[PDB]
Design a binder for this molecule. Structure first.
Ligand SMILES: CN1CCC(NC(=O)c2ccc(Nc3cc(NCc4ccccc4)c(C(N)=O)cn3)cc2)CC1
Length: 271
């Protein structure tokens, strides 16, 4: 087996905390090696470990320009491509003044094409949020963290099994996840994009406000009560009304009434 030999994976810095670190894969020892992102588990708890082998095989199998590339393994460590610009949540709040609604639409369209591919592979990400979207360059974004990703059963369109503010009502109430629960998450991502990930009006900061002053009432209970009423995240300030309408559709109470990614794609592209 031709792997990323541990002795050749030269550590540089941390990308996130298991954990992710930036390494230079230098098999020739002449410091001419390529920079790769390397994922590993730190406090290796037996259940998180089986989840890691599932994750590796999923990413290995996915081939979208909008999903992070799998590179290989080291030994367990998952080797992937390195996207230097970092997290989309950081990128939006740092360069907010230089990014217009047309550029946010380019990101929405790229995440959408990414998620559409995911669906055709009968995979459910489950953690679709701006915190797990990476930046290639100011004109290209890629989806990351397949840590929570689940493959749909060969006979079923749903799957019963923490990020509750991106979770659909069926996810909240009965732990049901499908491509349509990722459409609900996509609607929250559009909110994040169009608020430029402002800490002030984050989906987390906004729902807590809506939940009220009764903290002993379980979040899962208070959030579901709110989403059953029809209460939603507000229209982002200055957000194109055509976009906030697509957000509302992603937020339909029943999963069958939410648009598909295949349907959303042109609607985004044609604005
Ligand atoms: C501790 N402190 C360290 C410094 C800060 N971090 C960064 O400045 C950063 C710089 C480059 C980054 N590029 C990455 C990260 C990756 N996974 C990790 C990741 C996934 C999704 C979102 C964020 C991170 C992958 C991959 N192929 O999956 C590829 N490229 C990611 C962050 C904040 C956290």
């Amino acid at each position: 087996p031709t792997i990323f030999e541990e002795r050749h994976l030269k550590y540089i810095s941390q990308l996130g905390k298991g954990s992710v670190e930036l390494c230079r894969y230098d098999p020739l020892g002449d410091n001419t090696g390529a920079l790769v992102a390397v994922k590993q588990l730190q406090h290796s708890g037996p259940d998180q470990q089986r989840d890691f082998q599932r994750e590796i095989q999923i990413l290995k199998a996915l081939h979208s320009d909008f999903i992070v590339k799998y590179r290989g393994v080291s030994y367990l460590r998952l080797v992937m491509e390195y996207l230097p610009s970092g997290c989309l949540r950081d990128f939006l709040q740092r360069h907010r003044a230089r990014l217009d609604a047309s550029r946010l639409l380019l990101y929405s369209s790229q995440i959408c094409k990414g998620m559409e591919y995911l669906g055709s592979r009968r995979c459910v990400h489950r953690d679709l949020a701006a915190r797990n979207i990476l930046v290639e360059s100011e004109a290209h974004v890629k989806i990351a963290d397949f840590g929570l990703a689940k493959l749909l059963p060969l006979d079923k369109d749903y799957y019963v099994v923490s990020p509750i503010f991106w979770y659909a009502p069926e996810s909240l109430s009965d732990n049901i996840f499908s491509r349509q629960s990722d459409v609900w998450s996509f609607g929250v991502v559009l909110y994040e994009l169009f608020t430029y990930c402002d800490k002030s009006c984050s989906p987390s900061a906004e729902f807590l406000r809506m939940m009220g002053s009764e903290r002993d009432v379980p979040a899962l209970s208070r959030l579901l009560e709110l989403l059953e009423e029809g209460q939603r995240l507000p229209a982002p300030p200055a957000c194109p009304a055509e976009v906030h309408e697509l957000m509302k559709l992603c937020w339909a109470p029943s999963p069958q009434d939410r648009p598909s990614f295949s349907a959303l794609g042109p609607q985004l592209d044609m604005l």
